[PDB]
Amino acid sequence: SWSDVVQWSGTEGTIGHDGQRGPGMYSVGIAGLGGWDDGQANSFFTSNFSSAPVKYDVLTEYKSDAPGTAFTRQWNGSGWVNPAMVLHGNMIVNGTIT
Amino acid sequence: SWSDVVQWSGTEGTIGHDGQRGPGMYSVGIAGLGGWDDGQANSFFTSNFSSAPVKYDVLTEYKSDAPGTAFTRQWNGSGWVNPAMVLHGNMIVNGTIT
Amino acid sequence: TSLPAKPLEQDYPPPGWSKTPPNRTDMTQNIYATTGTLDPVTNRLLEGTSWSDVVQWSGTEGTIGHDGQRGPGMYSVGIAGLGGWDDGQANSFFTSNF
């Protein structure tokens, strides 16, 4: 009888992976914000980016009704940590110019 | 004579597709803006991103000479629609703080 | 995963080899086949003849291609002690984050 059926021609390769997505100096607001929200930040990225945040990702969270209350954190690839030196144009919090 | 020429070795696969591009809370201005411009917004993405806008994409359009005139829309994957809750730090339009 | 060395043993099959093409559970690996003159009386290779040069016999997985490019945005970043546009700092920003 016929032998065991075996592949004879070439095989198409699978889908690989390419360069990672690039973040930006974003600025988003959350209603009723009293502090930095890791959950809201993660939800923002999951909803829009369709991918996890990447290394050195900077996102700014603030309460719009009182623009002084603003929080900025840097994603170092595993979580949100306080960045060493991040300075926005909206860094004027307590209405003071010296 | 020789038989019909047929492939004998493996075949390289084609190029697949990977995770989608991630948007951000962008803020762009258009000269002479009297309202939200779908065409200008699409031209902005086509020129810079080199790709179509993705789901939950937020872009802010404003007239720089009068910063109060600002418009923000969310791209829900098929068009620009009014977002449910988007609140920027520049949401102060009519010079009023209450 | 690579081209095996030519078998030296006259056994059918030689050590490390199988008479029938084994199932390719791992796609990255390839089925390599070599041929020789078999003696049915001894169930081994014919005296004075050996296995042919080892050649690929099954399909080959393709390499990783490239897809649509990353999309930028209307970003706004600050640098301490800035007296003018900094190409080096801008490039460092993109290399670190993007």
Residue numbers in the entry:
A (entry chain A), B (entry chain A): 540 to 637
C (entry chain A): 491 to 588
Paper passage:
The T5 family of viruses are tailed bacteriophages characterized by a long non-contractile tail. The bacteriophage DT57C is closely related to the paradigmal T5 phage, though it recognizes a different receptor (BtuB) and features highly divergent lateral tail fibers (LTF). We present a composite map determined by electron cryo-microscopy (cryo-EM) at resolutions ranging between 2.9 Å to 4.9 Å of the entire T5-like phage particle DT57C, and atomic models comprising its core structural proteins. Our results provide a complete atomic structure of a T5-like phage, provide insights into the process of DNA ejection as well as a structural basis for the design of engineered phages and future mechanistic studies.
To obtain a reconstruction of the CFP region, we re-extracted particles after shifting the center of the reconstruction towards the capsid-distal region of the tail tip complex and performed a refinement with local angular searches. Even though the resulting reconstruction did not allow de novo building of the CFP protein due to the high flexibility of the region, it accommodated well a predicted structural model (see Methods section).
